Every structure is written in C-alpha cells, then in structure tokens.
Amino acid sequence: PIVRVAVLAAGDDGGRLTEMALPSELPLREILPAVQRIVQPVRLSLAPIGGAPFSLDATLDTVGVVDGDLLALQAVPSGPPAPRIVEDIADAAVIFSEARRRQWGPTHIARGAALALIGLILVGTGLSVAHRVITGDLLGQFIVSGIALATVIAALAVRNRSAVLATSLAVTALVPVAAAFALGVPGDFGAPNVLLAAAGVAAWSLISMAGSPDDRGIAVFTATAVTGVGVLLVAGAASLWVISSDVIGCALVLLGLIVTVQAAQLSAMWAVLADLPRRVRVSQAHQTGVIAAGVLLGVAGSVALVSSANASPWAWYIVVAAAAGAALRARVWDSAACKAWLLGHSYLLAVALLVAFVIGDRYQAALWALAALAVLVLVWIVAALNPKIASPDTYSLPMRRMVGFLATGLDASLIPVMALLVGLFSL
Amino acid sequence: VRLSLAPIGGAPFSLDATLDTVGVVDGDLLALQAVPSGPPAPRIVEDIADAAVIFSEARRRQWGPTHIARGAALALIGLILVGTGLSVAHRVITGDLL
Amino acid sequence: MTARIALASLFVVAAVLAQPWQTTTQRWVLGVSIAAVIVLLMFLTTRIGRALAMVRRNRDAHRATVVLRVDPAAPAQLPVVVGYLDRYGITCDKVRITHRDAGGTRRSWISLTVDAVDNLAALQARSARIPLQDTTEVVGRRLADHLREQGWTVTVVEGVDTPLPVVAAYRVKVLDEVLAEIPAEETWTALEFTGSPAEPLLTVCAAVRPLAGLTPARGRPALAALNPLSTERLDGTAVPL
C-alpha cells in the first residue's frame, strides 16, 4: 500500500525537494524520521502546501493524500504563546498596544501628501467644471487645463524618482485631462467634445502605458485606452458621417462584444527568460483591462439605446442579449479579475440604467431597474450560499454544448436584430 | 513475488547481504515490500532557493466559491446603497408613500 | 465558428426584405444575398485561406519538451505515463506516446511538455531565473527511474526520432480497432494525453506513406510538429476518454 509523494524542506539554506515513496497505513510519527533523514528544539510534520500540518497519529491514507502530491516539511504548529501579564493599567495601555505599527514616521506623511495631492486635483477638476458648465465662464477651462498641465508635468518628472506616486498620479491625471478636453468648441455640450476628450484620454493612456516603469497601474491604462479608442472611433462616426439618431450605442455595443470575444488575439497583439515572471502578469494585466473595456463600452452603448423612451422592443432584446453575451463568456476565461468583470457586466448595466433613468426623469422603470438589480443580487446570493448553480461540475454533458451553442448563437447573431434597430436593411 | 525488508522510504535489501553489512542498528523500522525489477531508483533531488513563492501560489487560491461570496457581499452593499440613493433622490424631488 | 453565422444572418436579413422582388431593384439584392449565403458556409473559403497559407509559407523557451525512448513497450505501462500530467508540483502540459512501425520494431517514445507559464511559480522557486530546461531534464529522469523501476527499460535520449523526415498525416475520430489497423513503407501512430490526469483527455494522430475511419489533414503542419522533441499540442479537439 505504498504511496509516492514529493517533499519540500526549505529551512537551512535554499531548500530540497525530493520524490520518495512512503509506506502508508503507518502513523506519520514513524515516517517523519525517514523524511528528515533523506531531505534535511522543534519537531516537524508533513503539511500539504496550502494548508495546516498533520496529526502525527493519523496516516497518509486517512488524511487525504493522493499519489503524487507535494508536501512541505513544516513545524508541528504551535502551543501556548506564553501570554504577558501587567497589573498597572496605564502600563497596560503602554505595553499592549505596541504591536500595531502605530509609528507615525516619515512614511505616513508621504502617503498623506500624495493622497492630498490626488484629492486636490480631483476636487479642483470638480469645482472648475461645475464653474464652467453651470454658469458660462472660460475661467473654468483655464483652471482645469492649468491643473491638468501641472499634474502631467508632475507625473512625467517622477517616473524614475518614486515610481508609485507617478503611476497613481498618471491614473488620477486623466480625469483633469478628460475634463479639459471636453470644453473646446463649447456648443450645447455637443457631439465632438466626447471625441476630443477621448483623444486626450487615449493619448495619455498610450503615452503612460508603454512608458510605465512597472505594474500596479497597467490594467486601468489599457482599459481606458481601448475605451478611448473605441468611443473615439464611434464619436468620429457620429460627428461626420451620419446624424446617427439612436445608433451611436448600436455601434458601441457591437464594438464592445467584438473587443470581448476576440480578446485572445488582441491581448497577444499588445505583448534569457529571466523577466518572464513579469511579462505574463503584464499580459494578464492587459486582459484584465481589455475585457473591462469590453464591459465598459458594452455598458456605454447599452445605456445609449434604452436611456429615453420610444425605443424599440428589439432594443430590449439586444440589451438582454448583450448582458447574456458578456455574462456567458465568463466560463471561457481562467483567471479571477476577468471572470469578475464578465460577471459584473450585468451589475454595471443595472446600475447604469438606474442612474440613466434617474437623470431621465422617468422614475417608473427606475424602481424596476432596482428590481432587476435585486434579482441579480438575489441570484448572486443563491449561487454564493449553496455552491450548486455556480459550480458547473454537477451539470449535464450535452447541456454544456447546448448552453455554449445558445451563447454563440445569441452574441454573434444579434446582427439581424441590429439590422432591425438601425434599419440597416430597410435601405 | 520477491518480498524483502526495506527501511522506510528506501530501497529493499540486497538478498545475499546480511543485516550487519547493510547498516541496520537495533531500533529501526523495516517494511516487507517487493523488490523493484531494475535499478535502485536513486531519487534525484533538484535544488530550490526561493520556496516561499510556492506557498505564495497555493494560499493564493483560484476563483472557486470564495470569490463568489465576496462578490455577493459587495453586490449586497451596492444594492443597499443605491436603494437608499434612488429612493431619496425620488423623495427630494417628488414623493408619495412609494 | 462564430462570425460566419453573423455574416449569414446579415445576408439572410438582407434577403427576405425584398418582398416586391420585381424589375431588379431589390431583386438584385435578393439574388446576391441568396448567392452569398450559399458560398460563405467555412469550408470553401477556408479552402481559399489554407491555399494562401500553404503557398505563402513555402519559402522561444516558453514550452520545453523531454522525450524518452522505450524499446519493449506496450499500453500496459499506460497508467504510470498518463498520471504524470500533474504530480510533484510541475503540471506537464501534454504527454505524448508515439510509436513507429518502420519494419517490425514498433519504436515507442514518450515526450513530456513543461510550460513556463502554467507552472511559473513552481519553476520560479528553483532560482531567481527560470531554469525550465533543467527542470524538464529532472522530470524526464524521474519518469525514467520510475519506468525502469516498474519493469520496462527506458533511456533518456536527446537526438530522439523522426516521424516526419526532420509522409501522409491522418487523424481519427475516437478507438481501439482503428489504431489496431495502423499501406506503404512507413507507419506511425501517436497518442497525446492532456488535461487533469484524474479525468484525462487524449488526442490522436497517425501517418502512413484514409484507411478505415480516419480523415486526412487537408492543409503539412500536423507532420511538422509531430516530432516528439517539438513543442505543440497536436491540433484537433481532445476526446472524453
């Protein structure tokens, strides 16, 4: 009844990982000297990597080890931690609160000043945009462009200085850039203000994404870069070619589903092997941006169709089709944040329709928008409490093919319903 | 079959060598298992130097149901927040008992 | 298998909305849409694309592979070579067992593929760099010592074999008789197991120089990476055991 494992002991210098074959139906206190003899005042125990060490009286079969696992050699966990005793109470205040990192230091001040600068940039943008669009005065665009130039010059100057203030500063620097680049040729808030703000957002995103020194601020840059490029091209289509009454969001949801489903070749297009641990994360970072834009434009068109009244019922088919397409594409992606954005597409859709109704002066489907959000939160709760409907292992073998067939027949073949929305073949 | 004594996690004994030349001291553990047909399988060790990364992979679990609970709790907080917000933006503008 | 349904649906919604099909005003659109539905359905235009690719092409260190040679082989060592898809914390991407019938010596080869992005953390714990090749050496020698333990003689090789000259590739739809069949002066079969060896899924490739129930590789890359030293996945969908 011998079982073969591979043990990992790394305490002295580096580590040793060796395969071996331990005779099972023996208590672990007998075969721990064998492992310590091969691979090596505290006793040790075999611990499966991802868990807690084992009771030494329990054997390897009745503890859940399959043939070929990887087990580390850890300590028999702990005991009593010898607790401290003080009887004066002011001494109890000064002793028992030390282990906190309560130290103020000259490293909380840097986080405070960087957060103060980010708050100043954001609230200066908010104040001067509310100064520009509520009254009429070009002091607003002047001050927004001034703080935007100030934060861009402060962003590009600390690229090789602190490298975390720079990246977060460049993320918060594309709110004042987008607010400055939506005020030229004022009009009545217009069509091409969106175009110029999109060009500025995509320009800053593409100059700071490839110019980024490291991670932690890559995925939001490629997300807003694909968002800026997509709404830039659709604003170009809506500014020059056709008047484009209800079909801005039509091209937007088409571009969102195109960016979502053809994301493997796209994500590969944005891409000694020492810095291979970097690149794959960066590669996965780009995926966690791009699907986000594949949600965001997928939101940013679906909020355009059914914002007002008098739309088509086929628009109410195509927004549910966009929701099912961007939610049923979750199982084909492996990582966590990709699945999170794909499952949260419909959540952002419900909140976006609710806020578009509450600006849209309806308040009759806004309660129903909250009802749809309650339905989604309810199915989230049911799939979260008992893991049955969220686990596809307890399903059927042709049911998977039928569900995937329905998905690829709804997200791809919504283009006749798109031709019914635009009237593309009433021409 | 060809059964022989083996130390724990070790190759079975060469059958024509005694228990004194093999190096078994009084107070060992032996198990009766069959002789492997071939080499003694020298169990090649490959060195590691940064093994704490491996634990950094295993405690960093996948999607599973654990992230579903975090998503569900976040959806509940967001629903309660916007259910306050829509309702108060209604009642500030114009509001009946609904 | 996605966009062709979209173009066919756009064409048939370009077709039916010409219900006055008279005097060639939208009857022209009717004719070109019924002609464009029947021509895009993708096996005649991927015939075009495959022609472009195969006449175009006529002029890494991310995946690595270690192959071993086993002379007196059989499927009787089949579990101990299918279980190594994921154990000892290394997650081998595919295991491939290829057999040569050039004469009477059905020469058998076992190739193990280890990526550098499916076990990035496992290889990064070895050193500060990524020693992928040495780790593939260690996994190959572990399979060598295990198979020499269990009975059948194996040897680590590095000039391993040639199933193409490094000549007719076919693939069967899985399962035991159709490989018992597999002419001319070269005969080759190849199984490839992958995907979570508790529930493993296997792909099949073969070559002679259609037989019973096989299908040719019409458009050659399947012979190009059929050498077990190569780093590929033996294109074709895997079957449920």
> Quick one: which H or E segment has residue C4?
helix C3-13
Of C112, C66, C109, nearest in space to C92 by CA: C112
- The dihedral through the CA atoms of A218, A222, A224, A228 has a sign that is positive
For residue C114 the two structure tokens come to 């280890």
DSSP string, A116-152: HHHHHHHHHHHHHHHHHHSS--THHHHHHHHHHHHHH
Q: Measuring CA to CA, how many Å separate A52 from each of A46, A49, A58, A142, A232?
A: 9, 8, 14, 61, 53
Q: Which residues pair with B31 in a beta bridge?
A: B6
Residue C169's H or E segment, with its range, is: strand C169-172
Helix/strand/coil for C108: strand
B4: part of which helix (H) or strand (E)? strand B3-7
Contact C10, A415 (CB under 8 A): yes
Could you tell me which residues come within 8 angstroms of residue C78 by beta carbon, excluding any fewer than 6 positions away? none
Instruction: Report DSSP state, residue A111.
Output: H
Output the DSSP codes for A218-231.
Answer: SHHHHHHHHHHHHH
Nearest Cα residue to A6 out of A55, A39, A53, A30:
A39
Interchain pair C130, A276: CB under 8 A: yes
Distance, CA of A4 to CA of C199 (rounded, Å): 20
- Whether residues A68 and C83 touch (CB distance < 8 A) is answered with yes
Q: Quick one: how far is CA A394 from the chain centroid? A: 28
Terminal-residue alpha carbon distance, chain B: 84
Angle, CA C52 vertex, CA C48 and CA C56 arms, to 5°: 170
What lies within 8 Å, CB to CB, of B21 at 6+ separation is none
Q: What is the DSSP letter of C239?
A: B
B71 vs A31, A50, A340: nearest CB = A340
- CA dihedral of A63, A68, A72, A76, whole degrees rounded to 10: 20
Closest chain B residue by Cα to residue A380: B72
Report whether B63 contacts A339 (CB < 8 A): yes
Neighbours of A30 (CB within 10 A): 14
Instruction: Decide if C12 touches A, using CB distance below 8 A.
Output: yes
Quote the CA–CA distance of C196 and A47 in Å, as a whole number.
Answer: 23
How far apart CA A221 and CA A126 sit, in angstroms, is 22
Do C178 and C203 form a contact (C-beta atoms < 8 A)? no
Q: For C173-224, give the secondary structure using H, E and C.
A: CCCCCCCCCCCCCCEEEEEEEECCCCCCEEEEEEEECCCCCEEECCCCHHHH
Non-local CB neighbours of C40 within 8 Å, separated by 6+ positions: C4, C7, C8, C11
Residue of C127, C90, C227, C86 whose CA lies nearest to A273: C127
Q: B79 by DSSP, 3-state: which?
A: helix
CB neighbourhood size of A214 (10 A): 12
Is residue A32 within 8 angstroms of chain B, CB to CB? Answer: no
Cα–Cα distance between C211 and C170 in angstroms, integer?
9
Q: Where are the beta strands (DSSP E) in A160-204?
A: none
Which helix (H) or strand (E) segment is C67 a member of? strand C63-70
Q: What is the CATH number of the domain that holds A25?
A: 3.10.20.90
**Cα separation, B4 vs B40, whole angstroms:** 14
Q: Measured between alpha carbons, how far is C238 from C241 in angstroms, rounded to an integer?
A: 9
Residue C31, token pair as written in the block: 């004719």
Q: Are C65 and C95 in contact (CB under 8 A)?
A: no
SS3 C133: helix
A63: its two tokens: 């503890």
Interatomic CA distance for residues A366 and B98, integer angstroms? 12
Q: What are phi and psi of A32, to 5 degrees?
A: -55, -35
CA pair distance C192, C214, nearest whole angstrom: 17
How far apart are alpha carbons B57 and C124 in whole angstroms? Answer: 11
Query: Would you call A419 and C124 a contact, using CB atoms and an 8 Å cutoff?
Result: no
Give the residue numbers spanning the domain of A65: 2-75
B45 interface with A at CB cutoff 8 Å:
yes
Q: Which residues of B touch C128 (CB under 8 A)?
A: 49-50
d(CA A56, CA A36): 14
Q: What gap in Å lies between CA A338 and CA A295, rounded to an integer?
A: 10
Report the candidate in C111, C114, C112, C120 with the shortest Cα–Cα distance to residue C63.
C114
Q: Which two tokens stand for residue C76?
A: 């009787």
Give the containing element (helix H, strand E) for A74. strand A70-75
- Cα angle, residue A129 at apex, residues A126 and A134 outer, rounded to 5°: 120
In order, the DSSP letters of B30-59 are EEEEEPPSS-------EE-S-THHHHHHHS
Instruction: List the structure tokens of C83.
Output: 């279980």
DSSP label at residue A63: G
Amino acid at A106: P
Neighbours of chain B (3+ CB pairs under 8 A): A, C
Q: State the Cα–Cα distance between residues A285 and A277, nearest whole angstrom.
A: 13
